[PDB]
UniProtKB/Swiss-Prot annotation, chain A:
The modification S-nitrosocysteine is found at residue 20. The transcriptional activation domain 3/TA3 does not participate in the direct transcriptional activity of RELA but is involved in the control by RELA of the accessibility of target gene promoters. Mediates interaction with ZBTB7A. NF-kappa-B is a pleiotropic transcription factor present in almost all cell types and is the endpoint of a series of signal transduction events that are initiated by a vast array of stimuli related to many biological processes such as inflammation, immunity, differentiation, cell growth, tumorigenesis and apoptosis. NF-kappa-B is a homo- or heterodimeric complex formed by the Rel-like domain-containing proteins RELA/p65, RELB, NFKB1/p105, NFKB1/p50, REL and NFKB2/p52. The heterodimeric RELA-NFKB1 complex appears to be most abundant one. The modification Phosphoserine is found at residues 256, 261. The modification Cysteine persulfide is found at residue 20. The gene is Rela. The chain holds residues 19 to 302 of 549 of the full protein. This is Transcription factor p65. GO terms for biological process: animal organ morphogenesis; antiviral innate immune response; canonical NF-kappaB signal transduction; cellular response to angiotensin; cellular response to hepatocyte growth factor stimulus; cellular response to hydrogen peroxide; cellular response to interleukin-6; cellular response to lipopolysaccharide. The modification Phosphothreonine is found at residues 158, 234. Ubiquitinated by MKRN2, leading to its proteasomal degradation. Degradation is required for termination of NF-kappa-B response. Polyubiquitinated via 'Lys-29'-linked ubiquitin; leading to lysosomal degradation. GO terms for cellular component: chromatin; cytoplasm; cytosol; glutamatergic synapse; NF-kappaB complex; NF-kappaB p50/p65 complex; nucleus; transcription regulator complex. The modification N6-acetyllysine is found at residues 104-105, 198, 201. Induction: Induced in myocardial tissue by lipopolysaccharide-induced myocarditis. It is found in: Nucleus; Cytoplasm.
From Swiss-Prot, chain B:
Inhibits the activity of dimeric NF-kappa-B/REL complexes by trapping REL (RELA/p65 and NFKB1/p50) dimers in the cytoplasm by masking their nuclear localization signals. On cellular stimulation by immune and pro-inflammatory responses, becomes phosphorylated promoting ubiquitination and degradation, enabling the dimeric RELA to translocate to the nucleus and activate transcription. Phosphorylation at positions 32 and 36 is prerequisite to recognition by the SCF(FBXW11) and SCF(BTRC) complexes, leading to polyubiquitination and subsequent degradation. Ubiquitin chain elongation is then performed by CDC34 in cooperation with the SCF(FBXW11) E3 ligase complex, building ubiquitin chains from the UBE2D3-primed NFKBIA-linked ubiquitin. The resulting polyubiquitination leads to protein degradation. Deubiquitinated by USP38, leading to NF-kappa-B inhibition. Keywords: ANK repeat, Cytoplasm, Disease variant, Ectodermal dysplasia, Host-virus interaction, Hydroxylation, Isopeptide bond, Nucleus, Phosphoprotein, Repeat, Ubl conjugation. This is NF-kappa-B inhibitor alpha.
From Swiss-Prot, chain C:
It is found in: Nucleus; Cytoplasm. The lineage of its organism: Eukaryota, Metazoa, Chordata, Craniata, Vertebrata. Constitutes the active form, which associates with RELA/p65 to form the NF-kappa-B p65-p50 complex to form a transcription factor. Together with RELA/p65, binds to the kappa-B consensus sequence 5'-GGRNNYYCC-3', located in the enhancer region of genes involved in immune response and acute phase reactions. The modification Phosphoserine is found at residue 91. There is a cross-link at residue 79 (Glycyl lysine isopeptide (Lys-Gly) (interchain with G-Cter in SUMO2)). It comes from Mus musculus. The chain holds residues 245 to 356 of 971 of the full protein. This is Nuclear factor NF-kappa-B p50 subunit.
Length: 282, 215, 112
């Protein structure tokens, strides 16, 4: 009897745009989206399946989750949020279309007017719990799912918040300062501590490029220590039966703009003598 | 290689040759790699030679240049036979004993077997008394943190039925689930989300120029 | 603000000879007000004290330290010895929680 986001939206990367220009053209990508593979904000209902509705509104990033002056745009959207029927045949609901339309502070006093007008306040906070500090830098999608009571009452499920999604910053200079290791097995799996300048954990990776080769270092968003260090494991090299060491490039890469830091040489090697605690040629 | 009257015999698959039966204190030292004959038994993958523990081979450190005990070697190589033989050796029931022993990386036999996804070795170990929730010193990760990092779903469901505490954190205060963010496996963030404490699920959000988990 | 905790260490073992580099992640530290103290309780009650060789410039952006292990009190022991390592502010002498570190011998160190 609950809604769980299975595919959080991509946090960094998307630029909140204004109505004057136009509606949009592109929608909020899913967290697992790559520059080639597409995904979208996806949810899943538990303990239930059948008719019903889903409402998706914007809300602040900070605890007192107040409605947000920005207004989701696109299909099934109106007044500022999204609202459509729930396909009864499946329990997983993805949104292939959703756009964050930003409001201009000069008219933010109007946007909020409408918010309470259409009483679009998922967590319904009082008018005194709606201060004037609106972090227009971010926003969080709110999932108001409605269904049927085991009897007849339209059961309104608990509103689930997505990870805040941010706007366009750009521009920072990816710089690798130190690396405790610039050599490892061709079978990959080597842990490496890398010290860098400030980086964002939802928008960073370690790009290992070679001649006609390319892989990424394995690590979690949590392995990004305070924006200035990254602990990850090296990917397997193209040739896993390497007989002679091979130099490869290793760099910081910001996905949202394809930006790359200066390359640092990295030398793959075979497991030869270590793969069996030395034996051959006694 | 300060070989003994057995390494050569050992490396070279031999009968009584590679198994001189005697039956200054009869013993077997180790090479420049700190490998005792028994380590070679495992590395070489010849249980029988190991089967013949005979004089209680190195009962204290019995380690290598990386800090592994023979059983450690058996667990990262994945030889079920050796884990089987090297387990009857009546010493592990002692204190500090192998099932709790760690190499110079603070890795347990359980850790090494989890790292290489040997689901069967992990099962036998926990069965024999290994702490499924034992932590490794670098970051305090349990084998469940490693299964998530290794993105092994088969491994994580197996640590779950072995008693792995879905909660329990790292020196950075992260539950295994908090390590799923930014990774691929939806299957992993599904079999853990449910189990994990409500406030051990999300990641810190740029707090006071630092953002610690707190623990 | 500047609590003292060792978050992650790329290595938790080392040779008694010392000199081995090590990356250490931690909570906010000031580069000129911090040290890495290695130590072990002794038979007589005193403690062997050893420090990590590093300069303020090694303290990376307030949350990391690239340092070099000190030499162990006895570089010729035959079996590894467990000691403790910890951070310490110079200004008030507070330390992070005592963390286990293993010094092992060097069967391959000098002469041939």
């Amino acid at each position: 009897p609950y809604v769980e986001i299975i595919e959080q939206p991509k946090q960094r990367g998307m630029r909140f745009r204004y109505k004057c220009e136009g509606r949009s053209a592109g929608s909020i990508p899913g967290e697992r989206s790559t520059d080639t593979t597409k995904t979208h904000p996806t949810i899943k209902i538990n303990g239930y399946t059948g008719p019903g509705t889903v409402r998706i509104s914007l809300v602040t990033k900070d605890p007192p989750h107040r409605p947000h002056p920005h207004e989701l745009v696109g299909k099934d959207c109106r007044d500022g949020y999204y609202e459509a029927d729930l396909c009864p045949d499946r329990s997983i609901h993805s949104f292939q279309n959703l756009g964050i339309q930003c409001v201009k502070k000069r008219d933010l006093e109007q946007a909020i007017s409408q918010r309470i007008q259409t009483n679009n306040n998922p967590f319904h906070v009082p008018i005194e719990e709606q201060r004037g500090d609106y972090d227009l830098n971010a926003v969080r999608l709110c999932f108001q799912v409605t269904v049927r009571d085991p009897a007849g009452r339209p059961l309104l499920l608990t509103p689930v918040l997505s990870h805040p999604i941010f706007d366009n910053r750009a521009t920072a200079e990816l710089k690798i300062c130190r690396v405790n290791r610039n050599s490892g097995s061709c079978l990959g799996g080597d842990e490496i501590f890398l010290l860098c300048d400030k980086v964002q954990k939802e928008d960073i990776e370690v790009y290992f490029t070679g001649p006609g080769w390319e892989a990424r270092g394995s690590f979690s968003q949590a392995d990004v220590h305070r924006q200035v260090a990254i602990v990850f494991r090296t990917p397997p090299y193209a040739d896993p039966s390497l007989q002679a060491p091979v130099r490869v490039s290793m760099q910081l890469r910001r996905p949202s703009d394809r930006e790359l830091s200066e390359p640092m040489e990295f030398q793959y090697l075979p497991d030869t003598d270590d793969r069996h605690r030395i034996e051959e040629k006694r | 290689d300060g070989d003994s009257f057995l390494h050569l015999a050992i490396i070279h698959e031999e009968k009584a040759l590679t198994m001189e039966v005697i039956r200054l204190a009869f013993l077997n030292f180790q090479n420049n790699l700190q490998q005792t004959p028994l380590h070679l038994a495992v590395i070489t993958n010849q249980p029988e030679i190991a089967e013949a523990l005979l004089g209680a081979g190195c009962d204290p450190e019995l380690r290598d240049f990386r800090g592994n005990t023979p059983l450690h070697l058996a667990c990262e190589q994945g030889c079920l036979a050796s884990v089987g033989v090297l387990t009857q050796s009546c010493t592990t029931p002692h204190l500090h004993s192998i099932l709790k022993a760690t190499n110079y990386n603070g890795h347990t036999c359980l850790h090494l077997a989890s790292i290489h996804g040997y689901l069967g070795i992990v099962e036998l170990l926990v069965s024999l008394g290994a702490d499924v929730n034992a932590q490794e010193p670098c970051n305090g990760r349990t084998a469940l943190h490693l299964a998530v990092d290794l993105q092994n779903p088969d491994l994580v469901s197996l640590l779950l039925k072995c008693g792995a505490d879905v909660n329990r954190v790292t020196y950075q205060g992260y539950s295994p689930y908090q390590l799923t963010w930014g990774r691929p496996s939806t299957r992993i963030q599904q079999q853990l989300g449910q189990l994990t404490l409500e406030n051990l699920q999300m990641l810190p959000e740029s707090e006071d120029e630092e953002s610690y988990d707190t623990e | 603000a500047s609590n003292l905790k060792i978050v992650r260490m790329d290595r938790t073992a080392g040779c008694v000879t010392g000199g081995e580099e090590i990356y250490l992640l931690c909570d906010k530290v000031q580069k000129d007000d911090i040290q890495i103290r290695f130590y072990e309780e002794e038979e007589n009650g005193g403690v062997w004290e050893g420090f990590g060789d590093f300069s303020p410039t090694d303290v990376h952006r307030q949350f990391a330290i690239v340092f070099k292990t000190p030499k162990y009190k006895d570089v010729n022991i035959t079996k590894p010895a467990s000691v403790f390592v910890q951070l310490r502010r110079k200004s008030d002498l507070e330390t992070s929680e005592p963390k286990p570190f293993l010094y092992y011998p060097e069967i391959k160190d000098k002469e041939e």
